[PDB]
Amino acid sequence: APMQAPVQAAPACMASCAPQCCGR
């Protein structure tokens, strides 16, 4: 049971397009 880092699910968020593709 290895402890993994959960990914907060973003809404179509991409750095290059962020923070617009991340809505805000």
Short mmCIF file of N, CA and C in Angstrom, two decimals:
data_model
loop_
_atom_site.label_atom_id
_atom_site.label_comp_id
_atom_site.label_asym_id
_atom_site.label_seq_id
_atom_site.Cartn_x
_atom_site.Cartn_y
_atom_site.Cartn_z
N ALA A 1 0.84 -1.23 0.00
CA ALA A 1 0.00 0.00 0.00
C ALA A 1 0.86 1.26 0.00
N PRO A 2 1.48 1.59 -1.15
CA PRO A 2 2.33 2.77 -1.26
C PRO A 2 1.52 4.07 -1.28
N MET A 3 1.99 5.07 -0.56
CA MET A 3 1.29 6.37 -0.51
C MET A 3 1.59 7.18 -1.77
N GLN A 4 0.55 7.44 -2.56
CA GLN A 4 0.70 8.19 -3.79
C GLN A 4 0.13 9.60 -3.65
N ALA A 5 0.54 10.49 -4.54
CA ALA A 5 0.08 11.87 -4.53
C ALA A 5 -1.13 12.03 -5.45
N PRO A 6 -2.32 12.23 -4.88
CA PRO A 6 -3.56 12.40 -5.65
C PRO A 6 -3.58 13.68 -6.44
N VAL A 7 -4.06 13.56 -7.66
CA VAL A 7 -4.15 14.68 -8.55
C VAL A 7 -5.48 15.34 -8.46
N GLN A 8 -5.45 16.57 -8.08
CA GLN A 8 -6.66 17.34 -8.01
C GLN A 8 -7.12 17.53 -9.42
N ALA A 9 -8.31 17.06 -9.70
CA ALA A 9 -8.82 17.14 -11.03
C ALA A 9 -9.22 18.56 -11.37
N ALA A 10 -8.49 19.09 -12.34
CA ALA A 10 -8.69 20.42 -12.85
C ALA A 10 -9.63 20.36 -14.05
N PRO A 11 -10.29 21.47 -14.37
CA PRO A 11 -11.22 21.54 -15.49
C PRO A 11 -10.55 21.99 -16.77
N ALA A 12 -9.95 21.04 -17.46
CA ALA A 12 -9.25 21.34 -18.71
C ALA A 12 -8.25 22.46 -18.51
N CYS A 13 -7.43 22.31 -17.49
CA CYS A 13 -6.43 23.30 -17.15
C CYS A 13 -5.05 22.86 -17.67
N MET A 14 -4.42 23.75 -18.45
CA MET A 14 -3.11 23.51 -19.07
C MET A 14 -2.24 24.75 -18.86
N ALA A 15 -1.03 24.60 -18.33
CA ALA A 15 -0.20 25.78 -18.06
C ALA A 15 -0.14 26.78 -19.22
N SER A 16 0.14 26.27 -20.43
CA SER A 16 0.28 27.09 -21.63
C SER A 16 -0.95 27.94 -21.91
N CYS A 17 -2.10 27.36 -21.64
CA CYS A 17 -3.36 28.00 -21.82
C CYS A 17 -3.92 28.49 -20.50
N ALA A 18 -3.26 28.19 -19.40
CA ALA A 18 -3.74 28.64 -18.13
C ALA A 18 -3.38 30.10 -17.97
N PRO A 19 -4.16 30.84 -17.18
CA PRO A 19 -5.31 30.32 -16.44
C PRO A 19 -6.65 30.55 -17.14
N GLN A 20 -6.62 30.57 -18.44
CA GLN A 20 -7.87 30.67 -19.19
C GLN A 20 -8.50 29.30 -19.40
N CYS A 21 -7.75 28.31 -19.83
CA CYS A 21 -8.33 26.99 -19.98
C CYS A 21 -8.70 26.40 -18.59
N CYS A 22 -8.41 27.16 -17.53
CA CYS A 22 -8.68 26.80 -16.14
C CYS A 22 -9.76 27.77 -15.64
N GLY A 23 -10.43 28.37 -16.62
CA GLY A 23 -11.51 29.32 -16.37
C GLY A 23 -11.06 30.59 -15.68
N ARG A 24 -10.33 30.44 -14.59
CA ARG A 24 -9.83 31.58 -13.83
C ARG A 24 -8.34 31.43 -13.53
#
